[PDB]
Amino acid sequence: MSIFIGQLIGFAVIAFIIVKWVVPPVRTLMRNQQEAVRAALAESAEAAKK
């Protein structure tokens, strides 16, 4: 279990690192893609109106 405790600590450390570093940029890319598709839909609507 000592190895188990150490491995849990390592998992927690890597989870902390990833949530701190990589989660923000990937969430930003996800939001950018969502906004891009929504903007494309709005452009289609306004072009049909035009």
45 sits near other proteins (criterion: CB under 8 A): no
Rounded to 5°, the CA angle 11-29-43 comes to: 155
d(CA 23, CA 43): 30
Give the contact letters, 12-31, x = binds to other proteins (CB under 8 A), - = no: -xx--xx-----------x-
1: which 2 tokens? 């279990």
With CB under 8 A as the rule, give the number of residues binding other proteins: 22
Which one of 23, 37, 42, 43 is in contact with other proteins (CB under 8 A)? Answer: 37
Residue 13's CB is within 10 A of a number of other CB atoms, namely: 10
Least Cβ distance, residue 36 to other proteins (angstroms): 10
